[PDB]
Design a protein around this ligand. Sequence first.
Ligand SMILES: CC(C)(COP(=O)(O)OP(=O)(O)OC[C@H]1O[C@@H](n2cnc3c(N)ncnc32)[C@H](O)[C@@H]1OP(=O)(O)O)[C@@H](O)C(=O)NCCC(=O)NCCS
Length: 91
Amino acid sequence: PPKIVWNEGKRRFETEDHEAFIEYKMRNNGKVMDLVHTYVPSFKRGLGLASHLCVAAFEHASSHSISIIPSCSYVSDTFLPRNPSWKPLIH
Ligand SMILES: CC(C)(COP(=O)(O)OP(=O)(O)OC[C@H]1O[C@@H](n2cnc3c(N)ncnc32)[C@H](O)[C@@H]1OP(=O)(O)O)[C@@H](O)C(=O)NCCC(=O)NCCS
């Protein structure tokens, strides 16, 4: 499919194996989620895993009324230009 989980205390959604993850920094007293860096290791690259990590932070922020700061350059450069319908999520 696959599967991504929320590791809240590390502040990221990540692959269950902990190796792929998108990290954020919350701001504005819980109202904003700043997506600061995303990480997929090599061998796992080019298979959409990065859109999947972004797809995990966006479905989540979206279900809680939290807007996104797209700091990570993967977010406002590849992921968002390919997923415009996520753009109204932007703070
Ligand atoms: C990029 C990251 C989100 C992992 O992504 P991923 O699962 O490989 O993303 P995918 O490979 O499926 O994405 C492919 C797309 O991401 C984009 N991308 C790659 N690096 C990027 C960057 N630094 N910033 C923005 N977008 C980028 C490419 O434009 C590519 O589109 P193209 O080949 O398809 O037409 C991120 O979590 C990471 O840490 N990457 C490290 C990547 C790296 O070190 N590459 C070294 C290449 S020498």
